[PDB]
Amino acid sequence: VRTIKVFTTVDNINLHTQVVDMSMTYGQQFGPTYLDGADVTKIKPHNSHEGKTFYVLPNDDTLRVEAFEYYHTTDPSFLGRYMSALNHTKKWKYPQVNGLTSIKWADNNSYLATALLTLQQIELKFNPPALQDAYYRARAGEAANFCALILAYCNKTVGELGDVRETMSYLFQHANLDSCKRVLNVVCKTCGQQQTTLKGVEAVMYMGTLSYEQFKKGVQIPCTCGKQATKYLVQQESPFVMMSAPPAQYELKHGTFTCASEYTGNYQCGHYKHITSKETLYCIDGALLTKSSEYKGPITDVFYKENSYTTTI
Ligand SMILES: Cc1ccc(N)cc1C(=O)N[C@H](C)c1cccc2ccccc12
Ligand SMILES: [Cl-]
Ligand SMILES: [Cl-]
Ligand SMILES: [Cl-]
Ligand SMILES: [Cl-]
Ligand SMILES: [Zn+2]
Ligand SMILES: [Zn+2]
Ligand SMILES: [Zn+2]
Ligand SMILES: [Zn+2]
C-alpha cells in the first residue's frame, strides 16, 4: 500500500490527519475535496500533496458542526460555491489605492470592488467567524478569501452581474445590526400620523433618495388610503446609514458623505466606480485613481456616518 499524510478541514482551523491511498482519488476516500479552491475530487494524490490542507464537504457530525460554527450555514452547496469563487479570486490583484484595498478589474468584479472599498469605511461586525476573519485579512491587503465568501453568501458566481445595494443588503444580514433602530413618522391628511420602528438591516438602508438631509425633512410616499403622505426620520441609532436610488446625476460635496457608488450604463451590464470623501474627493475605478475638489455624476448609493439622531420637527 502506497500512502501520503494530509490534513482535511471545513474551516481551515480544526485540521484532521488522514492517511490517503495514492492509487485512489480524493473523492473515493473523502467525498468532494478542494486544494486552494481547485476541485481535486477526481484527482489522485501527487507526492507534492504530502502534509497539505484539503477542504472536504462535511460527512460526519463533527464536520457539520464545525462548518456551521465557522460559516453560519448548513447549505451543503456552500463549500463548493466558495471554492469555485476562490479559484478565480486568488488570481485577482488587490492593489492599495488611497489607503484602501481595491480590486484590479476582472470577471465583471466592479460591484465587488465597490462593496469591498465601502466595507473598509463603515463600522460592521460579521456574525460568521469566516467573514470576520476574512474581512480583517482583506483590510490588511489579502482580500481573495473575503471576495470568494461574499460571492458564496450572495449566491453569485464569478462573472455574474451584481448590484452593490443587494450585495451590501446580504452582507448586513450576516452582521450584528441588532442595536440599529430607525423611527419613522408618516403624515397623511386622512389616516393622520403613524410611527413605525425598524431594526437591523431595515434600520440602515433606504431606497428612494440619496440625500440623508432630504430623508430628515421628509419625502413624498403613497398612503394606503389613496393619498400621498410624508415619511420623515424621527430617530436614527446606527454607526452609518445607506441611502440608494436609481442612478441619476447627483452632486457630491467634500465632507458631507463618507463614500458613494457611481453607476454608468444600462440596467445590469453597466460599470460601478467608488467615490470617497477624504481631504478631497477620490474616484477609485478598480486599480485606477483620480481626484477632484468637486463631483457631479451618476450616483445610486451614498453612505453617511451616524451615532444617534433625533429630529426637532
Ligand atoms: C448592476 C446590477 C446587477 C443586477 C441587477 N439586478 C441590477 C443592477 C443595476 O443595474 N443596478 C443599478 C444600480 C440600478 C438599480 C436600480 C435601478 C436602475 C435603473 C436603471 C439603471 C440601473 C439601475
Ligand atoms: Cl474543520
Ligand atoms: Cl446564523
Ligand atoms: Cl480569474
Ligand atoms: Cl449570520
Ligand atoms: Zn474536527
Ligand atoms: Zn449567523
Ligand atoms: Zn476568472
Ligand atoms: Zn391615510
Alpha carbon 171 to its chain centroid, in Å, reads 5
Q: Work out the end-to-end distance of the chain between its first and last CA atoms, rounded to an integer number of angstroms.
A: 81
Closest ligand (CA of 89): 4
Closest ligand (CA of 131): 5
Domain spans of the chain? Answer: 1-56, 57-180, 181-313
Resolution of the experimental structure, in angstroms: 2.1
Cα–ligand 4 centroid distance for 282 (angstroms) = 27
Residue to mutate (ligand 1; options 155, 268, 269; most atoms within 8 A of CB): 268
Alpha carbon distance 53, 11 (integer Å):
11
Give the bridge partners for 292, in sequence order: 281
In this structure, the residue with its CA closest to atom 11 of ligand 1 is: 163
Q: How many helices (H) and strands (E) does the chain have?
A: 9, 19
The experimental technique used to determine this model is X-ray
Point out the ligand 1 atom lying closest to the alpha carbon of residue 266: 21
Alpha helices (runs of H) in the chain, residue ranges in sequence order: 26-30, 61-71, 78-89, 110-119, 129-139, 144-154, 164-173, 201-204, 212-217
Spatial contact of 301 and 166, defined as CB atoms under 8 Å apart: no
Cα–ligand 7 centroid distance for 171 (angstroms) = 11
Listed residue (151, 114, 101) closest to 271, CA to CA: 114
For 56, what's the count of Cα atoms within 13 Å in the CB-facing half-sphere? Answer: 24
Cell of 292: 477632484
Cell of 13: 482551523
Max alpha carbon distance in the chain (Å)?
84
Spatial contact of 11 and 66, defined as CB atoms under 8 Å apart: yes
Taking the CA atoms of residue 26, residue 27, residue 32 and residue 33 in that order, the dihedral angle to the nearest 10 degrees is 10
Cell of 262: 457611481
Alpha carbon distance 229, 221 (integer Å):
5
In this structure, the residue with its CA closest to atom 14 of ligand 1 is: 246
